[PDB]
């Protein structure tokens, strides 16, 4: 067969250890999920430094410790007018319960008469999107280093029955060590079985979302396929002037690859960008292992990635500098509106 005794024993032991890790991780998540933290700081603990439809994201400095943070500010009356109560509550509830090295950390949260505040660790490299458009495309080893972190993060999230549903370079921050931080859990949902909401970004939508079917966590594995393609090509597999033309391409079962893609990469992508759910990697009897054991990941040391011991291929220019972010006009922050609705926050 493909593996001799030694390799087969090592792989089996590694897979059993993953199961053991995930079982403990689920116990810890569920304790925090059932008893969320609340009101762990206040606004005058922070200096506002710079702005980076529901609200704003600001770089702030903790007055006592000097640490910088990215503070998400949501206007309560505006969340309720846009029908975003459940999504806002759920995002904060998820963030305070999860713990993984590639998931942004919620360090504090609180509220006042007018706003909700989520104080996140500041990730100074900015979004992968900008780096990818600047560099053009990532070489396959560079793409694979990021892809491996998303695989591990989805393995973690899916074990908690969380579906993520908005993977894209725009939502991937690069930290000072060159590792990924997944941000933005506004569309994530705890889903044991199927769910039905039309949500996501057009280029990253799985066919079963477009075709108005009930769907499951396999939509995240489709989206990983789109992400790996876009990272390695510099453009996504399915694009057009208007979303409806993108969707026609997504459901067609046809994808074309640049000539510089390796055969291993094309094979992986054909199995992730698989319209037939009975054939899509991540959705089969062997689960995430079909992805982790694919030839394209043969050089990936999954534990070393998790332990952040792999030298990253790219370190963003390390100037609390805002070198890797844009500039915006600075409106003020004024302050008991919408009390009942946000009792749980």
């Amino acid at each position: 067969g493909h593996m001799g005794n030694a390799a087969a024993a090592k792989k089996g032991s590694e897979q059993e250890s993953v199961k053991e890790f995930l079982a403990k991780a689920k116990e810890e998540f569920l304790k925090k999920w059932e008893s969320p933290s609340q009101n762990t700081a206040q606004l005058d603990h922070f200096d506002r430094i710079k702005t980076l439809s529901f609200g704003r994201v600001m770089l702030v400095k903790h007055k006592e410790t000097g640490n910088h943070y990215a503070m998400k500010i949501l206007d309560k009356q505006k969340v309720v007018k846009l029908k975003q109560i459940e999504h806002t509550l759920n995002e904060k509830r998820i963030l305070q319960a999860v713990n993984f090295p590639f998931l942004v950390k919620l360090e504090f949260s609180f509220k006042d008469n007018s706003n909700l505040y989520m104080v996140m660790e500041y990730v100074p490299g900015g979004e992968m999107f900008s780096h990818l458009r600047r560099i053009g495309r990532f070489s396959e080893p560079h793409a694979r280093f990021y892809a491996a972190q998303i695989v591990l993060t989805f393995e973690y999230l899916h074990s908690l029955d969380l579906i993520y549903r908005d993977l894209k370079p725009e939502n991937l921050l690069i930290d000072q060590q060159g590792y990924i931080q997944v941000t933005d859990f506004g569309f994530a949902k705890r889903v044991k079985g199927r769910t039905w909401t039309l949500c996501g970004t057009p280029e990253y939508l799985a066919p079963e979302i477009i075709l108005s079917k009930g769907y499951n966590k396999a939509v995240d594995w489709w989206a990983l396929g789109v992400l790996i393609y876009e990272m390695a090509a510099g453009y996504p597999p399915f694009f057009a002037d208007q979303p409806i033309q993108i969707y026609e391409k997504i459901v067609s079962g046809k994808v074309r690859f640049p000539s510089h893609f390796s055969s291993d990469l094309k094979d992986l992508l054909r199995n992730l960008l698989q319209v037939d759910l009975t054939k899509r990697f991540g959705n089969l009897k062997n689960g995430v292992n079909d992805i982790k054991n694919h030839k394209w990941f043969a050089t990936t040391d999954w534990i070393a990635i998790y332990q952040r011991k792999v030298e990253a291929p790219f370190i963003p220019k390390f100037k609390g500098d805002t070198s890797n972010f844009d500039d915006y006009e600075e409106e003020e922050i004024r302050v008991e509106k919408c009390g009942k609705e946000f009792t749980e926050f």
Partner: peptide, 18 residues
């Protein structure tokens, strides 16, 4: 070329959710 088609799509900037 595909790259030219991507530029022509007008969807090279940040993409919003639906």
């Amino acid at each position: 070329t595909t790259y030219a088609d991507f530029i022509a799509s007008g969807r090279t900037g940040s993409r919003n959710a639906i």
